[PDB]
Amino acid sequence: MEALSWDCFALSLLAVALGLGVPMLHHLCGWDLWYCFHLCLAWLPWRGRQ
């Protein structure tokens, strides 16, 4: 498990969970403009970039 270490896996997961959850939940208890863009962007058929 050299290339794929667990110690680095866990910490890596928290970075994504909190990194994405922070802004995802921030909208719940923190109204902002980003929510507007994310709203329409999420409704889109295929978000991302052309």
UniProtKB/Swiss-Prot annotation:
Highly expressed in spleen, lymph node, tonsil and peripheral blood leukocytes, especially in plasmacytoid pre-dendritic cells. Levels are much lower in monocytes and CD11c+ immature dendritic cells. Also detected in lung and liver. Belongs to the Toll-like receptor family. Monomer and homodimer. Exists as a monomer in the absence of unmethylated cytidine-phosphate-guanosine (CpG) ligand. Proteolytic processing of an insertion loop (Z-loop) is required for homodimerization upon binding to the unmethylated CpG ligand leading to its activation. Interacts with MYD88 via their respective TIR domains. Interacts with BTK. Interacts (via transmembrane domain) with UNC93B1. Interacts with CD300LH; the interaction may promote full activation of TLR9-triggered innate responses. This is Toll-like receptor 9. It comes from Homo sapiens (Human). Key component of innate and adaptive immunity. TLRs (Toll-like receptors) control host immune response against pathogens through recognition of molecular patterns specific to microorganisms. TLR9 is a nucleotide-sensing TLR which is activated by unmethylated cytidine-phosphate-guanosine (CpG) dinucleotides. Acts via MYD88 and TRAF6, leading to NF-kappa-B activation, cytokine secretion and the inflammatory response. Controls lymphocyte response to Helicobacter infection. Upon CpG stimulation, induces B-cell proliferation, activation, survival and antibody production. Activated by proteolytic cleavage of the flexible loop between repeats LRR14 and LRR15 within the ectodomain. Cleavage requires UNC93B1. Proteolytically processed by first removing the majority of the ectodomain by either asparagine endopeptidase (AEP) or a cathepsin followed by a trimming event that is solely cathepsin mediated and required for optimal receptor signaling. Palmitoylated by ZDHHC3 in the Golgi regulates TLR9 trafficking from the Golgi to endosomes. Depalmitoylation by PPT1 controls the release of TLR9 from UNC93B1 in endosomes. The gene is TLR9. It is found in: Endoplasmic reticulum membrane; Early endosome membrane; Lysosome; Cytoplasmic vesicle, Phagosome. The chain holds residues 812 to 860 of 1032 of the full protein. The chain crosses the membrane at residues 9-29.
